[PDB]
Design a protein around this motif. Structure first.
Motif, PDB file in Angstrom:
ATOM      1  N   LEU B   9     -14.359 -71.449 -33.325  1.00  0.00           N
ATOM      2  CA  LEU B   9     -13.340 -70.677 -34.016  1.00  0.00           C
ATOM      3  C   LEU B   9     -13.874 -69.297 -34.356  1.00  0.00           C
ATOM      4  CD1 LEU B   9     -10.492 -70.727 -35.214  1.00  0.00           C
ATOM      5  CD2 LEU B   9     -11.487 -71.557 -37.356  1.00  0.00           C
ATOM      6  N   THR B  10     -13.291 -68.276 -33.737  1.00  0.00           N
ATOM      7  CA  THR B  10     -13.774 -66.915 -33.903  1.00  0.00           C
ATOM      8  C   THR B  10     -12.630 -65.975 -34.278  1.00  0.00           C
ATOM      9  OG1 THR B  10     -15.140 -65.177 -32.865  1.00  0.00           O
ATOM     10  CG2 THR B  10     -13.490 -66.266 -31.491  1.00  0.00           C
ATOM     11  N   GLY B  11     -12.954 -64.703 -34.493  1.00  0.00           N
ATOM     12  CA  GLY B  11     -11.966 -63.718 -34.898  1.00  0.00           C
ATOM     13  C   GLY B  11     -12.418 -63.076 -36.193  1.00  0.00           C
ATOM     14  N   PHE B  12     -11.844 -61.927 -36.529  1.00  0.00           N
ATOM     15  CA  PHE B  12     -12.217 -61.230 -37.756  1.00  0.00           C
ATOM     16  C   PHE B  12     -11.721 -61.972 -38.992  1.00  0.00           C
ATOM     17  CE2 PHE B  12     -13.989 -56.779 -38.063  1.00  0.00           C
ATOM     18  CZ  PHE B  12     -14.805 -56.927 -36.961  1.00  0.00           C
ATOM     19  N   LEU B  13     -12.464 -61.840 -40.089  1.00  0.00           N
ATOM     20  CA  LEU B  13     -12.197 -62.596 -41.311  1.00  0.00           C
ATOM     21  C   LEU B  13     -10.802 -62.352 -41.878  1.00  0.00           C
ATOM     22  N   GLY B  14     -10.270 -63.362 -42.560  1.00  0.00           N
ATOM     23  CA  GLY B  14      -8.949 -63.277 -43.153  1.00  0.00           C
ATOM     24  C   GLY B  14      -8.582 -64.538 -43.912  1.00  0.00           C
ATOM     25  N   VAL B 133      -1.599 -57.384 -37.939  1.00  0.00           N
ATOM     26  CA  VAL B 133      -1.529 -56.206 -38.790  1.00  0.00           C
ATOM     27  C   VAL B 133      -2.763 -55.316 -38.632  1.00  0.00           C
ATOM     28  CG1 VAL B 133      -1.285 -55.349 -41.157  1.00  0.00           C
ATOM     29  CG2 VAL B 133      -0.096 -57.431 -40.458  1.00  0.00           C
ATOM     30  N   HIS B 134      -3.940 -55.929 -38.547  1.00  0.00           N
ATOM     31  CA  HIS B 134      -5.189 -55.171 -38.607  1.00  0.00           C
ATOM     32  C   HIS B 134      -5.977 -55.108 -37.299  1.00  0.00           C
ATOM     33  CE1 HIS B 134      -4.631 -54.894 -42.916  1.00  0.00           C
ATOM     34  NE2 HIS B 134      -4.597 -56.211 -43.023  1.00  0.00           N
ATOM     35  N   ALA B 135      -5.536 -55.856 -36.292  1.00  0.00           N
ATOM     36  CA  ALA B 135      -6.304 -56.023 -35.055  1.00  0.00           C
ATOM     37  C   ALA B 135      -6.648 -54.720 -34.341  1.00  0.00           C
ATOM     38  CB  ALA B 135      -5.581 -56.958 -34.107  1.00  0.00           C
ATOM     39  N   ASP B 136      -5.671 -53.829 -34.222  1.00  0.00           N
ATOM     40  CA  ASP B 136      -5.882 -52.561 -33.531  1.00  0.00           C
ATOM     41  C   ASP B 136      -6.994 -51.734 -34.178  1.00  0.00           C
ATOM     42  OD1 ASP B 136      -4.084 -52.430 -31.255  1.00  0.00           O
ATOM     43  OD2 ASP B 136      -2.440 -52.444 -32.713  1.00  0.00           O
ATOM     44  N   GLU B 137      -6.951 -51.624 -35.503  1.00  0.00           N
ATOM     45  CA  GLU B 137      -7.962 -50.885 -36.257  1.00  0.00           C
ATOM     46  C   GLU B 137      -9.338 -51.535 -36.127  1.00  0.00           C
ATOM     47  N   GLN B 138      -9.373 -52.856 -36.239  1.00  0.00           N
ATOM     48  CA  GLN B 138     -10.619 -53.604 -36.138  1.00  0.00           C
ATOM     49  C   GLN B 138     -11.255 -53.457 -34.758  1.00  0.00           C
ATOM     50  OE1 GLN B 138      -8.955 -57.347 -37.129  1.00  0.00           O
ATOM     51  NE2 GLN B 138      -9.322 -57.165 -39.336  1.00  0.00           N
ATOM     52  N   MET B 139     -10.437 -53.551 -33.717  1.00  0.00           N
ATOM     53  CA  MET B 139     -10.944 -53.440 -32.356  1.00  0.00           C
ATOM     54  C   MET B 139     -11.370 -52.012 -32.019  1.00  0.00           C
ATOM     55  SD  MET B 139      -8.711 -56.152 -30.065  1.00  0.00           S
ATOM     56  CE  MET B 139      -7.136 -55.422 -30.481  1.00  0.00           C
ATOM     57  N   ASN B 140     -10.738 -51.030 -32.656  1.00  0.00           N
ATOM     58  CA  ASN B 140     -11.134 -49.642 -32.459  1.00  0.00           C
ATOM     59  C   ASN B 140     -12.490 -49.367 -33.094  1.00  0.00           C
ATOM     60  OD1 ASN B 140      -8.752 -49.190 -31.108  1.00  0.00           O
ATOM     61  ND2 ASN B 140      -7.763 -48.056 -32.773  1.00  0.00           N
ATOM     62  N   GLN B 141     -12.774 -50.071 -34.184  1.00  0.00           N
ATOM     63  CA  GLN B 141     -13.980 -49.828 -34.970  1.00  0.00           C
ATOM     64  C   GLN B 141     -15.167 -50.697 -34.563  1.00  0.00           C
ATOM     65  OE1 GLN B 141     -13.466 -49.893 -39.194  1.00  0.00           O
ATOM     66  NE2 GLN B 141     -12.383 -47.929 -39.235  1.00  0.00           N
ATOM     67  N   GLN B 146     -13.452 -56.915 -30.120  1.00  0.00           N
ATOM     68  CA  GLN B 146     -12.983 -57.010 -28.740  1.00  0.00           C
ATOM     69  C   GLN B 146     -13.703 -58.130 -27.995  1.00  0.00           C
ATOM     70  OE1 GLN B 146     -12.484 -53.303 -26.511  1.00  0.00           O
ATOM     71  NE2 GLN B 146     -12.521 -52.132 -28.424  1.00  0.00           N
ATOM     72  N   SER B 147     -15.002 -58.282 -28.255  1.00  0.00           N
ATOM     73  CA  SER B 147     -15.805 -59.318 -27.600  1.00  0.00           C
ATOM     74  C   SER B 147     -15.326 -60.725 -27.929  1.00  0.00           C
ATOM     75  CB  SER B 147     -17.282 -59.184 -27.975  1.00  0.00           C
ATOM     76  OG  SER B 147     -17.843 -58.003 -27.425  1.00  0.00           O
ATOM     77  N   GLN B 148     -14.994 -60.954 -29.197  1.00  0.00           N
ATOM     78  CA  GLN B 148     -14.494 -62.251 -29.631  1.00  0.00           C
ATOM     79  C   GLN B 148     -13.219 -62.621 -28.882  1.00  0.00           C
ATOM     80  OE1 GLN B 148     -14.107 -61.614 -33.836  1.00  0.00           O
ATOM     81  NE2 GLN B 148     -16.249 -62.115 -34.286  1.00  0.00           N
ATOM     82  N   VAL B 149     -12.330 -61.646 -28.717  1.00  0.00           N
ATOM     83  CA  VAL B 149     -11.113 -61.848 -27.937  1.00  0.00           C
ATOM     84  C   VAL B 149     -11.458 -62.105 -26.465  1.00  0.00           C
ATOM     85  CG1 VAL B 149      -9.029 -60.723 -27.049  1.00  0.00           C
ATOM     86  CG2 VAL B 149      -9.614 -60.535 -29.487  1.00  0.00           C
ATOM     87  N   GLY B 150     -12.471 -61.404 -25.963  1.00  0.00           N
ATOM     88  CA  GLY B 150     -12.879 -61.545 -24.572  1.00  0.00           C
ATOM     89  C   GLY B 150     -13.443 -62.917 -24.247  1.00  0.00           C
ATOM     90  N   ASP B 153     -10.514 -68.717 -25.042  1.00  0.00           N
ATOM     91  CA  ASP B 153      -9.730 -69.512 -24.109  1.00  0.00           C
ATOM     92  C   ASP B 153      -8.286 -69.574 -24.559  1.00  0.00           C
ATOM     93  OD1 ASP B 153     -11.846 -70.717 -22.260  1.00  0.00           O
ATOM     94  OD2 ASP B 153     -12.632 -71.115 -24.275  1.00  0.00           O
ATOM     95  N   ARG B 154      -8.076 -69.300 -25.842  1.00  0.00           N
ATOM     96  CA  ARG B 154      -6.742 -69.302 -26.412  1.00  0.00           C
ATOM     97  C   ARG B 154      -6.721 -68.299 -27.555  1.00  0.00           C
ATOM     98  NH1 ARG B 154      -4.823 -75.059 -28.047  1.00  0.00           N
ATOM     99  NH2 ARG B 154      -4.851 -75.366 -25.770  1.00  0.00           N
ATOM    100  N   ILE B 155      -5.700 -67.452 -27.589  1.00  0.00           N
ATOM    101  CA  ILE B 155      -5.598 -66.435 -28.629  1.00  0.00           C
ATOM    102  C   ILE B 155      -4.454 -66.759 -29.579  1.00  0.00           C
ATOM    103  CG2 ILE B 155      -5.150 -64.000 -29.117  1.00  0.00           C
ATOM    104  CD1 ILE B 155      -6.349 -63.417 -26.281  1.00  0.00           C
ATOM    105  N   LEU B 156      -4.775 -66.893 -30.863  1.00  0.00           N
ATOM    106  CA  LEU B 156      -3.770 -67.179 -31.875  1.00  0.00           C
ATOM    107  C   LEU B 156      -3.431 -65.904 -32.638  1.00  0.00           C
ATOM    108  CD1 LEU B 156      -4.912 -70.687 -33.182  1.00  0.00           C
ATOM    109  CD2 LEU B 156      -3.600 -70.026 -31.153  1.00  0.00           C
ATOM    110  N   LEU B 157      -2.258 -65.355 -32.341  1.00  0.00           N
ATOM    111  CA  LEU B 157      -1.823 -64.106 -32.943  1.00  0.00           C
ATOM    112  C   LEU B 157      -0.977 -64.402 -34.173  1.00  0.00           C
ATOM    113  CD1 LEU B 157      -1.862 -61.015 -32.601  1.00  0.00           C
ATOM    114  CD2 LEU B 157       0.235 -61.229 -31.262  1.00  0.00           C
ATOM    115  N   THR B 158      -1.510 -64.073 -35.345  1.00  0.00           N
ATOM    116  CA  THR B 158      -0.844 -64.397 -36.598  1.00  0.00           C
ATOM    117  C   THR B 158      -0.228 -63.166 -37.253  1.00  0.00           C
ATOM    118  OG1 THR B 158      -2.882 -64.110 -37.876  1.00  0.00           O
ATOM    119  CG2 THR B 158      -2.428 -66.298 -36.991  1.00  0.00           C
TER     120      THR B 158
END
Ligand SMILES: [Zn+2]
Ligand SMILES: [Zn+2]
Ligand SMILES: [Zn+2]
Lengths: 318, 318
Positions: B9-14, B133-141, B146-150, B153-158
């Protein structure tokens, strides 16, 4: 048995590394070095063998060893040990190339993963190669470029002769890594010996090399930075133990490296600690004597909660 | 013996992950899950034991297991097996938290590091939680965002209910990862079932989920991207083997994940392959039959030399 000294060579890709790696693999420099890297290039090979774990191990004409690596660094490390003990190869220093997009973190951890590795290998230090011309651009675009600097025990800054005013870069490197000295080679090439004997993985009392100054606007430029904590009061050994464990657990995925010297209440000897990501350790050292007792700590990491960290230690005050 | 299904389970904190992690550890969902994480928080603990490798293993009221981890993930993995085989605990799924700044890479490699782990554990997939809400800013920074998304195997967009028309985000995620399907999590909690059964680490013939379209300008927004290669011609098994090996060696530190189905000259069966960073494998699969033979490959990585890669495969043409 004498532990093999391990040096990690990191930094963003450049021609400077190539010159250094070429010198190691080709010249008669008198060092007995094993090199783990992805590509070696045109090198003079004496013999070649394949380890039990499929490691391609070449013995070069200058006596050094060139070993490939897979996704599992353990396999190369163990194949090197096997063939060392068999008398097939001979070396006492290991240099691992982790330039480009490589993360020094998992590489360091590999050396603590198994008892045999903890005994037979001894980490010397992490050396970061930094190109003065492109470093700012690289660090702005890629987090890992900063992380490599943050993991370093020694920073080798090259090409300041053509880059111009190096000081802006010098200050940024210090903000990222307050631990590691920056060596600025203005004329000449990087001496091979500057990779060795950093003592970077020993307990230190002087944990900060570049004392932080006051530049609030620029201090928040980097994503990786150093938090330097100075206490002029002693702390309880049980209490500070709880603070550290909570701190380290809170920023586990954020912390790169951290070291400290602690004034423990009622104890005449310094308490030193050091850690890399999740792995940390501590031990007593030199007695205070006539020297004024104090604590100095440095935490290097990404998006560290400096506020909470400083409050946590502040609360240790009686 | 039946392998434990492992979910990363990966992705930026929330608070989405937090609720999800809280739901796993607390609610009566009927899954027998062991969870490895840094913090567990307030959870009703039934029993607790310490593994031979110092792993803190708690049995929860809902039947699930909460296990701590050190810097060496192997320790927890092996301690879990020991207490499973001794009858101290029971579970058939393992969820490992690698959110925030964590790199899924070294965690994946751990599951291939030793034979016992290869046999007792089976990596099912990488799940990337993405905050609309925050993904674009997080991936820009942060590259790691971006690597976690890369790696996914499955992307959960909340949180698309508050984000709105996250269509722009859909395309960006697809550019980063052409492999992984995107599930838009409706307003509220992520259901547990969305984490499971991706079969992400098996050889697949349908390697691309989002077949790439033309967005020339937008295609340069990201540092991590997918290269999708389609061949309408068969290739020599020796030649394509050489191409792949050169490709992997050139971009070793850059490649996150890659999968493919190959039409091999003179061979009636599909050749499937898959890899993660330096570790790759291939095997023959379903015969072509009456289906038109073709090759489809997807390479996901940072700053990949797409030009050279495409040229390499083009050169395999008779
Ligand atoms: Zn191991
Ligand atoms: Zn869409
Ligand atoms: Zn609804």
């Amino acid at each position: 048995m004498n532990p093999i000294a391990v040096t990690l060579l990191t930094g963003f890709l450049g021609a400077g590394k190539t010159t250094l790696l070429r010198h190691i693999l080709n010249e008669q420099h008198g060092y007995k070095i094993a090199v783990i890297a992805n590509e070696f290039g045109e090198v003079s090979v004496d013999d070649q063998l394949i380890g039990d774990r499929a490691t391609q191990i070449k013995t070069l004409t200058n006596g050094c060893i060139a070993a490939s690596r897979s996704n599992e660094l353990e396999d190369a490390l163990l194949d090197l040990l096997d063939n060392l003990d068999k008398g097939n190869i001979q070396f006492d220093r290991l240099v691992i190339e982790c330039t480009g997009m490589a993360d020094p973190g998992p590489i360091i951890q590999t050396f603590f993963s198994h008892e045999v590795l903890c005994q037979r290998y001894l980490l010397d230090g992490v050396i970061a190669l930094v190109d003065a011309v492109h470093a700012d651009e690289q660090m702005n675009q890629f987090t890992i470029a900063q992380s490599q600097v943050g993991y370093a025990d020694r920073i080798l800054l090259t090409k300041t002769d053509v880059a111009g005013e190096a000081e802006k870069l010098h200050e940024r490197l210090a903000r990222i890594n307050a631990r590691a000295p920056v060596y600025t080679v203005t004329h000449g090439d990087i001496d091979l010996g500057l990779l060795f004997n950093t003592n970077g993985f020993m307990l230190e009392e002087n944990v900060v090399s570049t004392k932080p100054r006051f530049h609030f606007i620029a201090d928040k430029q980097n994503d990786i930075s150093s938090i330097v904590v100075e206490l002029d009061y002693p702390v309880d050994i049980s209490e500070v133990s709880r603070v550290m464990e909570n701190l380290l657990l809170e920023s586990a995925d954020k912390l790169l490296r951290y070291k400290g010297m602690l004034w423990i209440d009622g104890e005449p000897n310094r308490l030193l600690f050091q850690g890399v990501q999740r792995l940390y350790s501590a031990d007593w050292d030199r007695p205070w004597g006539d020297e004024k007792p104090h604590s100095t700590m440095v935490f290097i990491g990404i998006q560290l909660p400096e506020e909470e960290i400083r409050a946590a230690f502040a609360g240790l005050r009686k």
